[PDB]
């Protein structure tokens with residue numbers, strides 16, 4: 183519960199093993215102090231993932247601790263952390279335009 | 286093709302225009318940005334067809350669609366949104382210097 | 383006829399562009415109103431001939447001129463001023479009776 | 480200032496203003512939407528005879544005067560006139576305006 187991982191049962195694991203080999207890792211891109219990368223589960227696997235692993239108000243997966251993502255089949259170093267993109271509040275509209283310089 | 290607001294729709298928005306806020310403009314290596322903040326009570330008055338069913342928030346509006354809502358600025362500003370990845374995509378970060 | 387800035391003057395204003403603030407759009411019977419709040423420190427960078435020695439504020443500016451300062455807005459606005467009368471003139475008004 | 484207590488002139492004060500009352504010029508009446516306007520121009524010399532506490536320390540103009548006060552100066556006006564004052568915003572503030580647009584040009588059929 184946002185601190186304690188929820189261990190899979192024996193039957194859930196059997197349902198997941200078939201997909202383990204179909205998991206895809208993308209090349210990492212750098213930044214100031216962060217290496218980034220994304221994991222892609224095949225669309226079919228989502229039907230197998232436990233309901234309590236999904237965020238109710240979004241349909242995506244909730245942030246998972248290490249033992250949780252490893253149980254899904256993902257293999258990675260220890261330092262990796264799962265994060266979420268953050269959408270602004272509904273009353274803030276964003277705009278942008280191509281810059282104009284001087285000379 | 287934008288879906289223009291109606292007379293009666295625009296009239297229903299009137300009382301809120303007075304309080305729409307505009308931020309300064311900040312810029313990076315190639316783009317310029319700014320945000321507009323609408324009064325919270327105004328969202329209720331907005332026609333549902335201006336919203337994204339999945340997000341439960343306003344969809345991307347064309348020039349004429351945001352002008353309809355009472356927003357004024359150089360018409361060169363283009364709206365955009367920060368979209369969340371598909372469920373089957375997991376995002377990870379790592380310091381490790 | 384506008385007094386265009388010099389490349390040397392324009393460059394001096396460059397760092398303030400991101401802090402210029404804009405107010406909401408207000409209206410009345412037949413006009414829309416709005417003000418722009420410049421960063422105080424910026425006033426020291428604006429050319430002398432852009433000021434008004436009668437009050438110490440910026441003289442009325444033409445669109446091209448205020449756009450040359452880093453102010454961005456929609457098409458249509460026109461800058462104005464408040465003219466204070468001399469000590470021998472008193473002003474009166476009454477709710478249209 | 481929560482104006483309330485009018486500072487009426489004394490007999491001597493008013494007596495000092497008399498040779499000036501004849502020349503007080505009143506402009507025509509103007510009007511917009513909410514109010515009606517009037518500009519009163521008094522002789523420049525009359526200002527030297529006016530009481531110091533009637534002026535404004537900062538702007539050096541006359542301070543807002545209650546009905547009983549300006550009437551005591553010799554300004555003959557009808558009931559309902561209030562003296563107003565214009566205000567200039569701080570130097571870093573610029574003012575802008577423009578004619579309000581909407582479906583306001585009614586035609587004979589289905590505007």
Ligand SMILES: [Cl-]
Nearest residue numbers: 357358456457
């Ligand atoms: Cl506009």
Ligand SMILES: [Cl-]
Nearest residue numbers: 358359454455
């Ligand atoms: Cl703008």
Ligand SMILES: [Cl-]
Nearest residue numbers: 564565566567
């Ligand atoms: Cl004023």
